[PDB]
Amino acid sequence: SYYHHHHHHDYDIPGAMRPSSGELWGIHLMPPRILVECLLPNGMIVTLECLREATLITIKHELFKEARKYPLHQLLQDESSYIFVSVTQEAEREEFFDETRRLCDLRLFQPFLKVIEPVGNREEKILNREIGFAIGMPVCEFDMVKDPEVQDFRRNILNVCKEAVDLRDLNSPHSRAMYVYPPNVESSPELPKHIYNKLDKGQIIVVIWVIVPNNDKQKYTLKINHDCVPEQVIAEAIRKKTRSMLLSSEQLKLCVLEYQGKYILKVCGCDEYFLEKYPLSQYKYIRSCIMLGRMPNLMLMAKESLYSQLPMDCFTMPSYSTKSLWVINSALRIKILCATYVNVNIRDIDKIYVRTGIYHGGEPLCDNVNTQRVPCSNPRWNEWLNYDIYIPDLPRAARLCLSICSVHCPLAWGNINLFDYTDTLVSGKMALNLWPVPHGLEDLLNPIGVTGSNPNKETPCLELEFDWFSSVVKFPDMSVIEEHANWSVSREAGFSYSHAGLELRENDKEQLKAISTRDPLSEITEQEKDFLWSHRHYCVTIPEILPKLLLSVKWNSRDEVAQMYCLVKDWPPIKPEQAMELLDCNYPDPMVRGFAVRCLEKYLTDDKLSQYLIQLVQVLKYEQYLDNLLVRFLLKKALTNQRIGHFFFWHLKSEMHNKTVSQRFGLLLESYCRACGMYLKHLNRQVEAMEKLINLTDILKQEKKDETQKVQMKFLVEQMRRPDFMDALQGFLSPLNPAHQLGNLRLEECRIMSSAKRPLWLNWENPDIMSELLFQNNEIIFKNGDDLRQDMLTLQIIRIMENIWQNQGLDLRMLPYGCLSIGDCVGLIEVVRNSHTIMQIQCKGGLKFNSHTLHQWLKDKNKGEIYDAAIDLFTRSCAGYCVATFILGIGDRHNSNIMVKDDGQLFHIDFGHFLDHKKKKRERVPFVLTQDFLIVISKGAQECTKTREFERFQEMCYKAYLAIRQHANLFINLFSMMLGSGMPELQSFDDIAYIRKTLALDKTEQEALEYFMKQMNDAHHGGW
Amino acid sequence: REEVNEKLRDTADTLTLRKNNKLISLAQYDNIEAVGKKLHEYNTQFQEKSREYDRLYEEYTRTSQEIQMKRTAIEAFNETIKIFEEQCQTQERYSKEYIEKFKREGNEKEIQRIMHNYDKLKSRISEIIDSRRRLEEDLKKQAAEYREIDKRMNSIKPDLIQLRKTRDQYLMWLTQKGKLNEW
Ligand SMILES: O=C(O)CCc1ccc(O)cc1
């Protein structure tokens, strides 16, 4: 009667409710006592018992005592004459020079150690282990790479390394300290008005601290102008220290002059310094204190004790240092031969063929197939395919895309560049190993997918013959493309009158600027393309139209493409925000991307770079070759500035697991680590810390599952106290922010959370001199299971919406906490102290849960006139978080993913799928302000719909939403650049199209405003 | 612009013509209600299949990595063995020099202990090779299940898109005339 008695026979009673191998092959963490086969020079195998944690000095010394009890001891030298060696898990044979290292940290395969006399006697040069540890793959694995492009990248890219090292020691020690400790500084020295008003007539109280014995410290409260520089602030604090009943006025002036330049300003509690003449306000720390109603606490640090701290980078140069295409008078043809390794079931599948096409992002000719020959087993075609386009019409960035399909459905895919890194048109036979069908891609062929054969051997290997033409066919030089443009110009001037479908006009002159404004994802029509392409000379008037123009150009007509190359040549530089579109997958031409990197060199500030650095590293995936202008740009900026370098390293080191980029990023990381100076040692200490934490949580998750929290937690604390964990997890820099140092582990504040990912709550001592002034404890979460990079990105997108709103005079407060993905579903999350899930607030207030409990809880923290401003904080944050949330379309918000702070700020966490991923299998509103919230907005009131507080709040929502709608070009493009990462929520442009509807860009701003309210009104049921 | 791509998506070669969408030969230029249930029935079969497609794509890239792990482990074993092979040769150098250097003073005492070492060393090499050998046959049975993962993805993928397509067409039909959330 429940089930109409329908059985399920299939159902049996006994997914519901990785991994990186550990310290030894096949086991996560070596046993506390292990036996180690020691191969001696004399041929004797002597097995020693060792402690997991024992150093190689400890081991060697003990070995050479035990070696006396064995035969042939007289053959052996002193212990000091030898170094250890063994086969590691990456499968190379490391020579273990640093004998302070311990047995568990060696990444050995099997537990044996061979003894030898050290060869390659320049031992200096075999601290490439350092470089390989940081990168996570050995440098000898690049050495034996056959491909010339790689080897030519490796040697060529040192141009950059050298040039950037030379800027570092241009004013040493000042430039060196400016590299290592660069000034963390806002975009403009111009101030927002809501910030200014918090100044009582352009003035900050500041506190300059000093140390003199060392134990005792001394405040000096200056009240100075916000726009004054650090050198001024430093003088003022010296005046105050040294004024006395024994120094005349003039005596003081002569005491400041000797003193004024022996000091610099440090932030109390972290390694930030004020080394550059900027307004104090233009440093982020100051501008942070003003907003939070805090008193900047600086420190006078003498420069000799700062340059005493600094190193010497000492960069060493490594050991590793026709026919014009337009002559070829034929149409393109490519021979499909045979796939070898196709996994096809004969029982469902009819027939299989190789679909093909040439591409430029979008298509340049009739995409074809071949005949449905030898389907399923035995699969083999022998056809030249014939493509309607001439060999000279092929543009520099042309690419063959193919796929083996079913009947309609893809099985595999792979893409090749039709020219090589040296412009040579592809001839011969190629063996293309294929990539597998992704999630969101249902379409046949996949041209957004990466160029290159799969390094993975056991995959569909489709081979093919390319056409030969009596020579290496090379793409024409720029001088020759120029001349041909200059001819296409003078030629077209003489063409005669009656002519279809190609001075000016006033009606038209505005309609181009009409097009210029439309977002990337507003598709342009053939008429418009023609219309643009004909006025292309007037289009330089509006350099912002360029993306529309480039997409309008016919890339299959070399006459056009030579003309367009020549416009670009001296096109006027444009804004980074818009130029960034020119590095996404739709603009693959090198002259184009060249022009975009030339905009960044002029315009993009080291500040704005690091904001968009994620997007720029992703956009490397869409370059055709390894050596290209963007790579050299970023490589330079990273070696110019160690804050960028840090995140530049990690964003690469994150993706190294991913075989689409392991080569390219691997090679790039090598260059970085070879040039970045002493930061390589700092990165290796982070890299070593993160590994332990991975191996530790990897055990908690496999085997130690099914043991009470208590049991795991005792096993954790047992592990963390081991000397190697102590070594590895204590004196280092937080990767979320290298400014913050991490000292001793407070293991009693350190625990495993409730979650089934077994995320670690970790807590370090902030070992700064003035820790007290900023925070005595730095705590951050390490999370093994989840994929951080959706969150990482949504967090970024928020940070930018904030900066947009605030630099445009309106103060909604977002709290984009730190999130760093350091690997394949591994990462770090910043802990916001003094914050609780609404659901804790409801549990801890629950009488043996009333809608007021939140509001009650909040009053109970914020009493007096404090309360009034603390509601303003909640009202301001909650508005911003409404609009952002709506615009992005993040996961449904609820009581255990919403968080409020003691001071009354609210913010979201664990955002989940960002562009409305789950729901699309609509225009949802994910932040539904329940009664709980509306009560808090309306200090006492019932009927919260009706108050002014809600009208106020509504106004904040409307002003924010339109503010983002004017910078939507950016938000589209930021997401467009993120297509590179295989985030399922961003597989294709139509995924990004959600952000159009929700921002309502096809409508007019007034309609948009109403749509937002319409959307807000039905979700809430009344008010707007 | 948003919907016009999700209906032109997966079809053949402002008029939104699909050759990528060429916006403008142009070289010269009845139950009502019961079809509503079918939506839910197919919208459950489609999302039923999704996870079965998802679970396998993980297992695929697991086994892809699990296999690639196993290969390098062999590359390592082989290198490990080579050092043990080198070592047993390294002992046959200086052991057989020291047999005939004296061969007098504690001949039977010493050569037994030198011979013992050589034996342990060989028997070690014996264990590693069988350790390797065992990995390699486990590698093929992995590469087996691997071949089977793609096979079953490439049976489901056609059925998934057709299921998807009919689900849209039904969903179009209902909107033509005139709730859908629960279905
Ligand atoms: O030059 C610097 O080092 C400061 C950063 C900076 C870079 C480019 C620019 O145009 C202005 C400023």
mmCIF file of all heavy atoms in Angstrom, chain A residues 40 74 114 341 345 363 440-441 443 458 518 523 526-527 659 990 996, chain B residues 1-2 6 9-10 19 23-24 68 71 86-87 98 147 155 157 164:
data_model
loop_
_atom_site.group_PDB
_atom_site.id
_atom_site.type_symbol
_atom_site.label_atom_id
_atom_site.label_comp_id
_atom_site.label_asym_id
_atom_site.label_seq_id
_atom_site.Cartn_x
_atom_site.Cartn_y
_atom_site.Cartn_z
ATOM 1 N N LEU A 40 77.175 -0.030 1.802
ATOM 2 C CA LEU A 40 78.475 0.586 2.005
ATOM 3 C C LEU A 40 79.295 0.610 0.714
ATOM 4 O O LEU A 40 78.873 -0.008 -0.284
ATOM 5 C CB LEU A 40 79.213 -0.142 3.114
ATOM 6 C CG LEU A 40 78.702 0.286 4.481
ATOM 7 C CD1 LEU A 40 79.271 -0.652 5.544
ATOM 8 C CD2 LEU A 40 79.047 1.750 4.782
ATOM 9 N N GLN A 74 88.592 -1.770 7.167
ATOM 10 C CA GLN A 74 89.844 -1.132 6.713
ATOM 11 C C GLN A 74 89.775 -0.434 5.335
ATOM 12 O O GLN A 74 90.484 0.556 5.101
ATOM 13 C CB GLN A 74 91.007 -2.145 6.747
ATOM 14 C CG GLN A 74 90.939 -3.296 5.736
ATOM 15 C CD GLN A 74 89.937 -4.398 6.076
ATOM 16 O OE1 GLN A 74 89.171 -4.294 7.032
ATOM 17 N NE2 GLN A 74 89.939 -5.461 5.281
ATOM 18 N N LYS A 114 72.464 4.243 0.176
ATOM 19 C CA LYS A 114 73.809 3.930 -0.344
ATOM 20 C C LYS A 114 74.840 5.047 -0.059
ATOM 21 O O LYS A 114 74.533 6.244 -0.112
ATOM 22 C CB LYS A 114 73.759 3.605 -1.836
ATOM 23 C CG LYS A 114 75.111 3.651 -2.523
ATOM 24 C CD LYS A 114 75.031 3.018 -3.883
ATOM 25 C CE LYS A 114 76.362 3.119 -4.589
ATOM 26 N NZ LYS A 114 76.314 2.304 -5.828
ATOM 27 N N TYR A 341 43.743 3.175 -29.563
ATOM 28 C CA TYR A 341 43.337 2.775 -28.208
ATOM 29 C C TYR A 341 41.937 3.324 -27.859
ATOM 30 O O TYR A 341 41.753 4.003 -26.843
ATOM 31 C CB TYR A 341 44.420 3.272 -27.229
ATOM 32 C CG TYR A 341 44.374 2.728 -25.812
ATOM 33 C CD1 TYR A 341 44.896 1.468 -25.501
ATOM 34 C CD2 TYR A 341 43.854 3.501 -24.766
ATOM 35 C CE1 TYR A 341 44.869 0.985 -24.194
ATOM 36 C CE2 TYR A 341 43.819 3.029 -23.462
ATOM 37 C CZ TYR A 341 44.325 1.777 -23.171
ATOM 38 O OH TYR A 341 44.282 1.338 -21.857
ATOM 39 N N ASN A 345 32.152 0.137 -26.666
ATOM 40 C CA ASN A 345 31.257 -1.011 -26.524
ATOM 41 C C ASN A 345 30.470 -1.204 -27.816
ATOM 42 O O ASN A 345 29.802 -0.278 -28.285
ATOM 43 C CB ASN A 345 30.292 -0.809 -25.338
ATOM 44 C CG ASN A 345 29.691 0.602 -25.283
ATOM 45 O OD1 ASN A 345 30.422 1.603 -25.298
ATOM 46 N ND2 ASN A 345 28.363 0.691 -25.205
ATOM 47 N N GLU A 363 35.429 29.600 -35.522
ATOM 48 C CA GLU A 363 35.738 28.838 -36.792
ATOM 49 C C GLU A 363 36.122 29.694 -38.049
ATOM 50 O O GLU A 363 35.491 30.737 -38.265
ATOM 51 C CB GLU A 363 34.509 27.994 -37.165
ATOM 52 C CG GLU A 363 33.361 28.817 -37.776
ATOM 53 C CD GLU A 363 31.985 28.181 -37.679
ATOM 54 O OE1 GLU A 363 31.570 27.820 -36.558
ATOM 55 O OE2 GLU A 363 31.301 28.079 -38.725
ATOM 56 N N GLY A 440 30.769 19.698 -18.531
ATOM 57 C CA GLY A 440 29.869 20.686 -19.114
ATOM 58 C C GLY A 440 29.903 20.746 -20.627
ATOM 59 O O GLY A 440 28.944 21.218 -21.235
ATOM 60 N N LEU A 441 30.998 20.279 -21.233
ATOM 61 C CA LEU A 441 31.095 20.184 -22.692
ATOM 62 C C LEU A 441 30.347 18.961 -23.232
ATOM 63 O O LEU A 441 30.801 17.817 -23.072
ATOM 64 C CB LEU A 441 32.558 20.155 -23.144
ATOM 65 C CG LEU A 441 32.775 20.199 -24.669
ATOM 66 C CD1 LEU A 441 33.807 21.251 -25.047
ATOM 67 C CD2 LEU A 441 33.158 18.835 -25.235
ATOM 68 N N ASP A 443 29.199 19.550 -26.565
ATOM 69 C CA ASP A 443 29.447 19.813 -27.981
ATOM 70 C C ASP A 443 30.578 18.943 -28.537
ATOM 71 O O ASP A 443 31.365 18.373 -27.783
ATOM 72 C CB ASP A 443 29.715 21.300 -28.199
ATOM 73 C CG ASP A 443 28.463 22.141 -28.013
ATOM 74 O OD1 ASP A 443 27.733 22.316 -29.010
ATOM 75 O OD2 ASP A 443 28.202 22.614 -26.884
ATOM 76 N N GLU A 458 48.638 5.902 -22.214
ATOM 77 C CA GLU A 458 47.517 4.955 -22.342
ATOM 78 C C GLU A 458 46.203 5.720 -22.528
ATOM 79 O O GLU A 458 45.385 5.812 -21.605
ATOM 80 C CB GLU A 458 47.440 3.992 -21.138
ATOM 81 C CG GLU A 458 48.610 3.011 -21.041
ATOM 82 C CD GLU A 458 48.439 1.730 -21.840
ATOM 83 O OE1 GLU A 458 47.451 1.003 -21.595
ATOM 84 O OE2 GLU A 458 49.317 1.435 -22.686
ATOM 85 N N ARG A 518 28.834 48.094 -25.204
ATOM 86 C CA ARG A 518 28.214 46.784 -24.939
ATOM 87 C C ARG A 518 29.198 45.764 -24.392
ATOM 88 O O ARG A 518 30.328 45.685 -24.857
ATOM 89 C CB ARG A 518 27.588 46.222 -26.210
ATOM 90 C CG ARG A 518 26.345 46.958 -26.661
ATOM 91 C CD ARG A 518 26.082 46.784 -28.142
ATOM 92 N NE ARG A 518 26.181 45.397 -28.587
ATOM 93 C CZ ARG A 518 26.000 45.012 -29.849
ATOM 94 N NH1 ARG A 518 25.702 45.916 -30.773
ATOM 95 N NH2 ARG A 518 26.108 43.725 -30.197
ATOM 96 N N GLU A 523 26.664 39.721 -28.313
ATOM 97 C CA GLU A 523 27.163 39.239 -29.594
ATOM 98 C C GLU A 523 26.901 40.261 -30.722
ATOM 99 O O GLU A 523 25.840 40.898 -30.788
ATOM 100 C CB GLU A 523 26.586 37.849 -29.894
ATOM 101 C CG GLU A 523 27.138 37.133 -31.130
ATOM 102 C CD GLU A 523 28.643 36.895 -31.135
ATOM 103 O OE1 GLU A 523 29.274 36.899 -30.056
ATOM 104 O OE2 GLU A 523 29.193 36.679 -32.241
ATOM 105 N N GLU A 526 26.934 40.303 -38.266
ATOM 106 C CA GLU A 526 27.712 40.425 -39.506
ATOM 107 C C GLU A 526 27.671 41.839 -40.068
ATOM 108 O O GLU A 526 28.708 42.351 -40.498
ATOM 109 C CB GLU A 526 27.269 39.411 -40.584
ATOM 110 C CG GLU A 526 28.342 38.387 -40.965
ATOM 111 C CD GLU A 526 28.600 37.337 -39.888
ATOM 112 O OE1 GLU A 526 27.634 36.656 -39.475
ATOM 113 O OE2 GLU A 526 29.770 37.174 -39.467
ATOM 114 N N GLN A 527 26.490 42.466 -40.048
ATOM 115 C CA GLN A 527 26.362 43.866 -40.473
ATOM 116 C C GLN A 527 27.272 44.735 -39.634
ATOM 117 O O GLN A 527 28.061 45.517 -40.167
ATOM 118 C CB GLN A 527 24.944 44.404 -40.316
ATOM 119 C CG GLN A 527 23.914 43.816 -41.256
ATOM 120 C CD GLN A 527 23.158 42.661 -40.628
ATOM 121 O OE1 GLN A 527 23.769 41.753 -40.054
ATOM 122 N NE2 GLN A 527 21.828 42.691 -40.722
ATOM 123 N N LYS A 659 47.768 17.859 -15.332
ATOM 124 C CA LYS A 659 48.603 17.525 -16.520
ATOM 125 C C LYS A 659 48.393 18.365 -17.792
ATOM 126 O O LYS A 659 49.188 18.260 -18.718
ATOM 127 C CB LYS A 659 48.489 16.036 -16.853
ATOM 128 C CG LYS A 659 49.238 15.170 -15.854
ATOM 129 C CD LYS A 659 48.451 13.936 -15.449
ATOM 130 C CE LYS A 659 49.045 13.289 -14.206
ATOM 131 N NZ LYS A 659 48.178 12.201 -13.666
ATOM 132 N N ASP A 990 28.481 30.681 -22.014
ATOM 133 C CA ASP A 990 27.073 30.701 -21.611
ATOM 134 C C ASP A 990 26.872 30.464 -20.103
ATOM 135 O O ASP A 990 25.861 30.897 -19.558
ATOM 136 C CB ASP A 990 26.180 29.793 -22.501
ATOM 137 C CG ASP A 990 26.537 28.308 -22.429
ATOM 138 O OD1 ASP A 990 27.218 27.877 -21.469
ATOM 139 O OD2 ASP A 990 26.118 27.563 -23.351
ATOM 140 N N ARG A 996 24.880 38.306 -16.806
ATOM 141 C CA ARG A 996 24.171 39.277 -17.630
ATOM 142 C C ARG A 996 22.748 39.459 -17.132
ATOM 143 O O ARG A 996 22.342 40.583 -16.856
ATOM 144 C CB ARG A 996 24.131 38.853 -19.097
ATOM 145 C CG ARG A 996 25.483 38.566 -19.722
ATOM 146 C CD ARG A 996 25.340 38.447 -21.227
ATOM 147 N NE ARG A 996 25.092 39.750 -21.866
ATOM 148 C CZ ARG A 996 24.048 40.072 -22.644
ATOM 149 N NH1 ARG A 996 23.077 39.202 -22.951
ATOM 150 N NH2 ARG A 996 23.982 41.300 -23.142
ATOM 151 N N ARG B 1 19.473 36.416 -25.973
ATOM 152 C CA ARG B 1 20.893 35.954 -26.143
ATOM 153 C C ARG B 1 21.275 34.717 -25.324
ATOM 154 O O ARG B 1 22.192 33.990 -25.714
ATOM 155 C CB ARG B 1 21.883 37.087 -25.823
ATOM 156 C CG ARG B 1 22.303 37.898 -27.033
ATOM 157 C CD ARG B 1 22.859 39.228 -26.600
ATOM 158 N NE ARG B 1 23.323 40.002 -27.742
ATOM 159 C CZ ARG B 1 23.547 41.318 -27.733
ATOM 160 N NH1 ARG B 1 23.349 42.047 -26.631
ATOM 161 N NH2 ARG B 1 23.974 41.921 -28.840
ATOM 162 N N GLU B 2 20.593 34.483 -24.202
ATOM 163 C CA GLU B 2 20.981 33.412 -23.271
ATOM 164 C C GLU B 2 20.338 32.090 -23.703
ATOM 165 O O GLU B 2 21.009 31.065 -23.814
ATOM 166 C CB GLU B 2 20.603 33.729 -21.802
ATOM 167 C CG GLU B 2 20.476 35.197 -21.377
ATOM 168 C CD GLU B 2 21.608 36.109 -21.831
ATOM 169 O OE1 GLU B 2 22.712 35.632 -22.171
ATOM 170 O OE2 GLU B 2 21.385 37.336 -21.846
ATOM 171 N N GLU B 6 21.203 28.040 -25.978
ATOM 172 C CA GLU B 6 20.792 26.735 -25.396
ATOM 173 C C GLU B 6 19.732 25.962 -26.194
ATOM 174 O O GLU B 6 19.331 24.869 -25.779
ATOM 175 C CB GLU B 6 20.295 26.900 -23.947
ATOM 176 C CG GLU B 6 21.257 27.599 -22.992
ATOM 177 C CD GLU B 6 22.728 27.274 -23.243
ATOM 178 O OE1 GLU B 6 23.117 26.083 -23.212
ATOM 179 O OE2 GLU B 6 23.498 28.223 -23.495
ATOM 180 N N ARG B 9 22.500 25.299 -29.446
ATOM 181 C CA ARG B 9 23.538 24.375 -28.958
ATOM 182 C C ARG B 9 23.240 22.943 -29.400
ATOM 183 O O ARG B 9 22.097 22.491 -29.310
ATOM 184 C CB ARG B 9 23.646 24.440 -27.427
ATOM 185 C CG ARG B 9 24.559 23.419 -26.776
ATOM 186 C CD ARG B 9 24.754 23.769 -25.317
ATOM 187 N NE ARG B 9 25.436 22.710 -24.586
ATOM 188 C CZ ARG B 9 25.690 22.739 -23.278
ATOM 189 N NH1 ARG B 9 25.324 23.783 -22.532
ATOM 190 N NH2 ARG B 9 26.318 21.714 -22.710
ATOM 191 N N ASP B 10 24.276 22.251 -29.878
ATOM 192 C CA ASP B 10 24.173 20.877 -30.391
ATOM 193 C C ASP B 10 23.202 20.751 -31.599
ATOM 194 O O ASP B 10 22.339 19.867 -31.617
ATOM 195 C CB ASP B 10 23.802 19.879 -29.259
ATOM 196 C CG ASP B 10 24.733 19.961 -28.038
ATOM 197 O OD1 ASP B 10 25.959 20.131 -28.208
ATOM 198 O OD2 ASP B 10 24.235 19.831 -26.898
ATOM 199 N N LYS B 19 26.582 28.287 -38.112
ATOM 200 C CA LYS B 19 27.478 27.629 -39.071
ATOM 201 C C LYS B 19 28.421 26.684 -38.326
ATOM 202 O O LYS B 19 28.825 26.960 -37.197
ATOM 203 C CB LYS B 19 28.290 28.657 -39.875
ATOM 204 C CG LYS B 19 27.458 29.745 -40.544
ATOM 205 C CD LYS B 19 28.169 30.437 -41.707
ATOM 206 C CE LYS B 19 29.609 30.864 -41.418
ATOM 207 N NZ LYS B 19 30.666 29.902 -41.861
ATOM 208 N N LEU B 23 25.351 35.818 -36.101
ATOM 209 C CA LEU B 23 24.210 36.744 -35.971
ATOM 210 C C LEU B 23 24.167 37.651 -37.204
ATOM 211 O O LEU B 23 25.213 37.977 -37.765
ATOM 212 C CB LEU B 23 24.293 37.589 -34.677
ATOM 213 C CG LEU B 23 23.871 36.954 -33.337
ATOM 214 C CD1 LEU B 23 24.745 35.752 -33.000
ATOM 215 C CD2 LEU B 23 23.885 37.986 -32.212
ATOM 216 N N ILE B 24 22.963 38.021 -37.645
ATOM 217 C CA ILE B 24 22.800 38.920 -38.803
ATOM 218 C C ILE B 24 21.820 40.044 -38.428
ATOM 219 O O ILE B 24 20.676 40.086 -38.866
ATOM 220 C CB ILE B 24 22.395 38.151 -40.100
ATOM 221 C CG1 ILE B 24 23.397 37.004 -40.382
ATOM 222 C CG2 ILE B 24 22.347 39.094 -41.305
ATOM 223 C CD1 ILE B 24 23.086 36.134 -41.588
ATOM 224 N N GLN B 68 49.384 6.211 -13.120
ATOM 225 C CA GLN B 68 50.608 6.996 -13.277
ATOM 226 C C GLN B 68 51.487 6.912 -12.027
ATOM 227 O O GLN B 68 52.712 6.891 -12.144
ATOM 228 C CB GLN B 68 50.323 8.443 -13.706
ATOM 229 C CG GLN B 68 50.158 8.572 -15.219
ATOM 230 C CD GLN B 68 50.092 10.011 -15.708
ATOM 231 O OE1 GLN B 68 49.026 10.628 -15.697
ATOM 232 N NE2 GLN B 68 51.225 10.541 -16.171
ATOM 233 N N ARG B 71 53.322 3.412 -12.270
ATOM 234 C CA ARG B 71 54.414 3.388 -13.246
ATOM 235 C C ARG B 71 55.731 3.905 -12.656
ATOM 236 O O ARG B 71 56.777 3.250 -12.739
ATOM 237 C CB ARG B 71 54.064 4.202 -14.491
ATOM 238 C CG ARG B 71 52.860 3.676 -15.253
ATOM 239 C CD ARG B 71 53.014 3.839 -16.758
ATOM 240 N NE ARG B 71 51.726 4.089 -17.391
ATOM 241 C CZ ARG B 71 51.561 4.426 -18.667
ATOM 242 N NH1 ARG B 71 52.600 4.543 -19.503
ATOM 243 N NH2 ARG B 71 50.335 4.645 -19.114
ATOM 244 N N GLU B 86 74.223 -3.288 -8.787
ATOM 245 C CA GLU B 86 75.528 -2.625 -8.693
ATOM 246 C C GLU B 86 76.259 -2.977 -7.410
ATOM 247 O O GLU B 86 77.464 -3.141 -7.438
ATOM 248 C CB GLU B 86 75.402 -1.102 -8.774
ATOM 249 C CG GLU B 86 76.746 -0.377 -8.852
ATOM 250 C CD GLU B 86 76.630 1.128 -8.706
ATOM 251 O OE1 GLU B 86 75.498 1.660 -8.765
ATOM 252 O OE2 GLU B 86 77.683 1.784 -8.507
ATOM 253 N N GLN B 87 75.535 -3.063 -6.294
ATOM 254 C CA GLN B 87 76.139 -3.391 -5.002
ATOM 255 C C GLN B 87 76.689 -4.829 -4.960
ATOM 256 O O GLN B 87 77.813 -5.049 -4.481
ATOM 257 C CB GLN B 87 75.151 -3.148 -3.848
ATOM 258 C CG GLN B 87 75.801 -3.172 -2.462
ATOM 259 C CD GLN B 87 76.620 -1.921 -2.129
ATOM 260 O OE1 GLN B 87 76.784 -1.021 -2.955
ATOM 261 N NE2 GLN B 87 77.137 -1.864 -0.902
ATOM 262 N N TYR B 98 89.685 -9.755 -1.348
ATOM 263 C CA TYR B 98 90.063 -10.097 0.032
ATOM 264 C C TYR B 98 89.997 -11.574 0.382
ATOM 265 O O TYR B 98 90.589 -11.981 1.386
ATOM 266 C CB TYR B 98 89.303 -9.241 1.065
ATOM 267 C CG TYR B 98 90.173 -8.121 1.577
ATOM 268 C CD1 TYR B 98 90.438 -7.003 0.781
ATOM 269 C CD2 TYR B 98 90.789 -8.203 2.829
ATOM 270 C CE1 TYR B 98 91.264 -5.980 1.230
ATOM 271 C CE2 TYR B 98 91.615 -7.188 3.289
ATOM 272 C CZ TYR B 98 91.847 -6.075 2.493
ATOM 273 O OH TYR B 98 92.676 -5.070 2.948
ATOM 274 N N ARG B 147 40.144 0.903 -18.759
ATOM 275 C CA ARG B 147 39.523 0.752 -20.086
ATOM 276 C C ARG B 147 38.010 0.636 -19.943
ATOM 277 O O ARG B 147 37.268 1.230 -20.724
ATOM 278 C CB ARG B 147 40.127 -0.427 -20.889
ATOM 279 C CG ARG B 147 41.416 -0.054 -21.632
ATOM 280 C CD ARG B 147 42.017 -1.189 -22.454
ATOM 281 N NE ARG B 147 42.690 -2.181 -21.607
ATOM 282 C CZ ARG B 147 43.933 -2.095 -21.113
ATOM 283 N NH1 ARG B 147 44.726 -1.055 -21.357
ATOM 284 N NH2 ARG B 147 44.398 -3.079 -20.348
ATOM 285 N N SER B 155 29.158 4.777 -23.189
ATOM 286 C CA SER B 155 27.798 4.253 -23.378
ATOM 287 C C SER B 155 26.760 5.219 -22.812
ATOM 288 O O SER B 155 25.688 5.388 -23.390
ATOM 289 C CB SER B 155 27.633 2.904 -22.681
ATOM 290 O OG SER B 155 28.743 2.071 -22.923
ATOM 291 N N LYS B 157 27.132 8.619 -22.182
ATOM 292 C CA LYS B 157 27.154 9.955 -22.827
ATOM 293 C C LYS B 157 26.111 10.175 -23.944
ATOM 294 O O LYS B 157 25.481 11.241 -23.981
ATOM 295 C CB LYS B 157 28.570 10.336 -23.329
ATOM 296 C CG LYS B 157 29.261 11.428 -22.511
ATOM 297 C CD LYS B 157 28.671 12.808 -22.796
ATOM 298 C CE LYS B 157 29.416 13.914 -22.061
ATOM 299 N NZ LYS B 157 29.128 15.271 -22.605
ATOM 300 N N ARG B 164 18.629 14.388 -22.066
ATOM 301 C CA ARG B 164 18.644 15.829 -21.867
ATOM 302 C C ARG B 164 17.758 16.513 -22.899
ATOM 303 O O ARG B 164 16.929 17.347 -22.545
ATOM 304 C CB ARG B 164 20.072 16.378 -21.933
ATOM 305 C CG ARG B 164 20.186 17.892 -21.767
ATOM 306 C CD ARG B 164 21.624 18.347 -21.950
ATOM 307 N NE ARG B 164 21.746 19.685 -22.535
ATOM 308 C CZ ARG B 164 21.529 19.998 -23.818
ATOM 309 N NH1 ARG B 164 21.136 19.084 -24.707
ATOM 310 N NH2 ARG B 164 21.697 21.257 -24.221
#
